[PDB]
Ligand binder design. Sequence first.
Ligand SMILES: *[C@@H]1O[C@H](CO)[C@@H](O)[C@H](O)[C@H]1NC(C)=O
Lengths: 43, 43
Amino acid sequence: YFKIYSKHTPINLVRDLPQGFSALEPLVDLPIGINITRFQTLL
Amino acid sequence: FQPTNGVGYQPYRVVVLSFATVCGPKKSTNLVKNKCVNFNFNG
Ligand SMILES: *[C@@H]1O[C@H](CO)[C@@H](O)[C@H](O)[C@H]1NC(C)=O
């Protein structure tokens, strides 16, 4: 099972991550069986 | 594969499969409230 857990929040700063807490919630849970050792971003 | 052949040597309307990515279908009952009952929800 490949997983994604995810969150959205408002912010006001680009150059650091927030010193505040909010947990990430599941949206993908698929028994794809493919192992993962590498990745690349799309933008 | 002629339609005129007897069902032994005639063409095969035939196929097979194994039963996780998928499983056989769950049945369900009414949601019998307030009584003492045996139950299954989602397994
Ligand atoms: C994932 O790794 C195992 C060995 O740990 C390997 O047997 C399996 O084939 C790999 N998965 C895929 C999709 O190849």
